[PDB]
Write a protein that binds this ligand. Sequence first.
Ligand SMILES: [Mg+2]
Lengths: 197, 4
Amino acid sequence: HELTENQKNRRFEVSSSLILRNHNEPFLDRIVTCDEKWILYDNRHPKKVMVTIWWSAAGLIHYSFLNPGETITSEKYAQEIDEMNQKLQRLQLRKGPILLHDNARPHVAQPTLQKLNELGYEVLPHPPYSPDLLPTNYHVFKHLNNFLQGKRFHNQQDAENAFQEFVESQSTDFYATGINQLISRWQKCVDCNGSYF
Amino acid sequence: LYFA
Ligand SMILES: [Mg+2]
């Protein structure tokens, strides 16, 4: 993607504001974050399965694979947020969670917005065209790409089993790395006047 | 800390 001037401005504005917010009142520890990815069956039309992973600095919260019958809708994403939140509630056994996710249509439509309001989630400002500011993408997915190269799955189950081994392979500090990098990435974005860095 |  070739950033326009308005897109760089939005990146710069959000970056600068988030760095100051965290300095004023640190909130990284309250972030829950996610993203969707298509996992190809052949990693050397083509079969693929979509995964959604949810996590915080404390660790893996929830992940799910899009199954036959299911549609990628705001209705589905709302049900996923409810399930994720139940798992977070078990795992956290005090300030409310803050969701960082991109502007994919289901993320920003009803009834996703109402679900977030009902469960007590703030949504973090996120600028368009910025996977370099989305930790699931710049951290988890980067390491997952490394892991999948260059495997071959036969079915959806083998693809799931490889994602599982990937997740279970990670050390306890792996997630914290991705989250904590946000400060440095916001700053690099400010340093480059809202461009990529 | 991190998840149990
Ligand atoms: Mg995305």
